Amino acid sequence: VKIFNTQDVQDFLRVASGLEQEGGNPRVKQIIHRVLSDLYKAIEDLNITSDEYWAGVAYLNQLGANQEAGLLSPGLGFDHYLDMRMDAEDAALGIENATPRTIEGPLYVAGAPESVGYARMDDGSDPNGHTLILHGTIFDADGKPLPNAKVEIWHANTKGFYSHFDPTGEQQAFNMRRSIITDENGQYRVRTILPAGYGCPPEGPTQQLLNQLGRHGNRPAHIHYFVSADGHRKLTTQINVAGDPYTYDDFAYATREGLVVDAVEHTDPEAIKANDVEGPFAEMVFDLKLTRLVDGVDNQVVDRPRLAV
Amino acid sequence: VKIFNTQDVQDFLRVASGLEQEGGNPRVKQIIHRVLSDLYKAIEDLNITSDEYWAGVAYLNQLGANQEAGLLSPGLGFDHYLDMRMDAEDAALGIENATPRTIEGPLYVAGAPESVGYARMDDGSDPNGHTLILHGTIFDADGKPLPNAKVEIWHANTKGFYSHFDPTGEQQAFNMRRSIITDENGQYRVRTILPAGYGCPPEGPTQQLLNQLGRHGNRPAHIHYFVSADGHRKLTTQINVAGDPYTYDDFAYATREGLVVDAVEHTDPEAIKANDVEGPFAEMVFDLKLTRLVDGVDNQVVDRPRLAV
Ligand SMILES: CCCCCCCCCCCCCCC(=O)OC[C@H](COP(=O)(O)OCC[N+](C)(C)C)OC(=O)CCCCCCCCC
Ligand SMILES: CCCCCCCCCCCCCCC(=O)OC[C@H](COP(=O)(O)OCC[N+](C)(C)C)OC(=O)CCCCCCCCC
Ligand SMILES: [Fe+3]
Numbered sequence: 001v002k003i004f005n006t007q008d009v010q011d012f013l014r015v016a017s018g019l020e021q022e023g024g025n026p027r028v029k030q031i032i033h034r035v036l037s038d039l040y041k042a043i044e045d046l047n048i049t050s051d052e053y054w055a056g057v058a059y060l061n062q063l064g065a066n067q068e069a070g071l072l073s074p075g076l077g078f079d080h081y082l083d084m085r086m087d088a089e090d091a092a093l094g095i096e097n098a099t100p101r102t103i104e105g106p107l108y109v110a111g112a113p114e115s116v117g118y119a120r121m122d123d124g125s126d127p128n129g130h131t132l133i134l135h136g137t138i139f140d141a142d143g144k145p146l147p148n149a150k151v152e153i154w155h156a157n158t159k160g161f162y163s164h165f166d167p168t169g170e171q172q173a174f175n176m177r178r179s180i181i182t183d184e185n186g187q188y189r190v191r192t193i194l195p196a197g198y199g200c201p202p203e204g205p206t207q208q209l210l211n212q213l214g215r216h217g218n219r220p221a222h223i224h225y226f227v228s229a230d231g232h233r234k235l236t237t238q239i240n241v242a243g244d245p246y247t248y249d250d251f252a253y254a255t256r257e258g259l260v261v262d263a264v265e266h267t268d269p270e271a272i273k274a275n276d277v278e279g280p281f282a283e284m285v286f287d288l289k290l291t292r293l294v295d296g297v298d299n300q301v302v303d304r305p306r307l308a309v
Numbered sequence: 310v311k312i313f314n315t316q317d318v319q320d321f322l323r324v325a326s327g328l329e330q331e332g333g334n335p336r337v338k339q340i341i342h343r344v345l346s347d348l349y350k351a352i353e354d355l356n357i358t359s360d361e362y363w364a365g366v367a368y369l370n371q372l373g374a375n376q377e378a379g380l381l382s383p384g385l386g387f388d389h390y391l392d393m394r395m396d397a398e399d400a401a402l403g404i405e406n407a408t409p410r411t412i413e414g415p416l417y418v419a420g421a422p423e424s425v426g427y428a429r430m431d432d433g434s435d436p437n438g439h440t441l442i443l444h445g446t447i448f449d450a451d452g453k454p455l456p457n458a459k460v461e462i463w464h465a466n467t468k469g470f471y472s473h474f475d476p477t478g479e480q481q482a483f484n485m486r487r488s489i490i491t492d493e494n495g496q497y498r499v500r501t502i503l504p505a506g507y508g509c510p511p512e513g514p515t516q517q518l519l520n521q522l523g524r525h526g527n528r529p530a531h532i533h534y535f536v537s538a539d540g541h542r543k544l545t546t547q548i549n550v551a552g553d554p555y556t557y558d559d560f561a562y563a564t565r566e567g568l569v570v571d572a573v574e575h576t577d578p579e580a581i582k583a584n585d586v587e588g589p590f591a592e593m594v595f596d597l598k599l600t601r602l603v604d605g606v607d608n609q610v611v612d613r614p615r616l617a618v
């Protein structure tokens with residue numbers, strides 16, 4: 001069956017998209033018209049049957065019903081694709097991104113408590129939590145330590161769950177989520193625990209689709225960062241714990257060279273005492289370098305729906 | 310800045326689609342690879358920003374959270390387009406569809422009370438209800454009256470609400486939904502009320518998107534039909550109440566010539582008695598002709614998720 005190219009289908013697409021209507025948002029009509037045309041044509045080229053089509057429609061209800069559209073998005077590469085475009089755009093502007101950007105993920109929560117230079121991020125409720133001392137320096141576009149920079153950090157516990165999105169009931173609010181203002185030396189330091197990789201809800205629609213593609217829904221253990229400072233663009237990035245089995249096989253394709261960091265284990269009394277910890281702990285050091293605004297504006301900040309508490 | 314047609318993106322699309330993955334369903338992979346490709350390209354061609362992109366993802370979650378994907382589908386023309394494809398395929402097979410097919414819509418419910426030849430489908434709870442006597446003859450593929458055919462009929466009340474999907478929660482199960490087995494004369498007859506036009510939930514995601522297209526979300530008053538019989542293909546169609554303002558401006562583009570039916574108003578006592586009614590009523594007559602199976606196979610039945618109670 002080949003009717004996509006006929007006038008009847010072509011005119012129909014314009015009507016359905018409201019291209020004839022006077023009211024509405026032209027930008028939305030422009031996008032809808034293109035997306036519907038491509039889908040109508042894809043249904044024809046791939047000879048998608050009504051049975052297949054309705055299975056897709058049902059999937060869609062299920063995806064939104066479980067609020068996983070933002071989990072499927074990175075899984076299908078969109079999130080990373082958008083970063084590639086941003087990288088291509090910076091490269092064209094001659095902007096050299098000292099610290100590579102990567103995806104934000106759908107689990108950011110605004111409102112975390114903030115403090116200067118230091119904070120403990122966890123409430124010690126994770127029975128199997130291994131102490132992690134994470135610290136580093138923030139450099140401005142000139143390569144100079146930058147005090148007063150806001151470093152936002154969030155990560156999962158040893159079960160791969162984030163506060164506010166923990167499927168097993170509650171975690172204290174903002175557990176493992178803190179905002180840290182860099183100190184006089186442009187440094188930040190946090191005490192938290194080593195996160196475990198995140199895994200998509202096994203029975204959720206995202207995992208269901210990934211199974212049909214022969215793919216897993218796992219992420220290596222990682223820690224999220226937002227770094228913002230006057231005169232600089234907002235940096236969105238992450239660090240992956242070196243050695244993780246999924247370091248180079250992340251279902252969200254967010255891992256990058258330069259973002260893989262080693263977690264050094266300390267067990268000697270001198271180190272333990274010096275960082276005033278109660279026992280053996282891991283240490284990770286990670287510095288971030290920011291880029292300047294482009295003609296006074298941040299050409300890459302993303303405004304997207306984020307939970308606020 | 311264009312990167313879609315570069316090796317890095319093309320290779321990425323195959324990876325995200327699971328193409329070089331051993332497990333999975335190849336049919337799903339093939340469709341996902343085509344859809345992702347088109348969407349990655351549309352994002353580049355229309356220069357869709359991350360901000361615009363995340364607004365689309367958010368919409369997707371609400372679409373599903375409100376179980377409206379099956380409502381938006383017809384509004385974007387997919388349902389009708391699939392019917393166009395079916396008609397095209399029937400024409401190619403030399404099949405003449407005496408009674409044209411049209412969309413099923415997303416509100417069919419399986420399990421309705423069944424009776425022979427006659428049935429009253431409303432329970433009288435509807436205050437503004439206007440008695441309607443809808444009757445007709447079902448013809449087999451040779452034009453002969455066909456007894457024991459199963460006629461399924463469902464429609465909205467005077468408020469434009471369907472039982473099982475009535476926000477007011479007024480209606481009892483299967484109100485205005487019945488299956489009628491045609492009698493010895495191949496006839497079906499029902500007493501019900503004139504339905505009112507259906508309108509998408511004004512606050513719902515379907516209507517919100519339709520507003521952005523400068524479009525309304527109304528359907529003319531109509532009555533749905535499923536007619537099935539041994540040796541014949543299952544017919545999916547509907548009739549429109551002639552005169553309705555939205556007859557030729559249905560948001561689901563389901564109207565077709567041959568399906569617009571006049572509701573004859575009867576007011577003399579002679580007709581009221583001959584029909585066993587309490588007063589003035591409307592009458593609609595609609596006969597349906599079925600098509601024979603194609604080598605013992607119904608090549609157009611659609612198996613899609615349908616509510617069963
Ligand atoms: C409102 C407009 C929206 C339009 C949507 C775009 C068009 C839709 C494309 C259709 C893709 C259909 C392919 C799915 C399919 O034909 O079968 C998919 C599988 C089912 O597996 P089976 O084992 O065969 O099930 C049966 C097992 N039994 C036999 C034992 C019973 O189930 C699934 O959920 C996979 C479905 C994923 C498709 C979602 C794509 C969306 C990406 C953005
Ligand atoms: C698995 C994930 C797959 C994802 C597929 C992604 C889709 C592709 C990109 C879609 C881009 C949509 C662009 C929409 C947009 O740029 O803005 C959309 C509006 C917003 O209204 P505004 O008044 O502009 O908001 C602003 C008010 N201010 C100005 C005062 C701030 O609202 C909406 O509902 C938009 C609804 C979009 C419909 C998407 C349909 C695709 C389904 C077939
Ligand atoms: Fe994460």
Ligand SMILES: [Fe+3]
Binds near residue numbers: 416464531
């Ligand atoms: Fe309907």
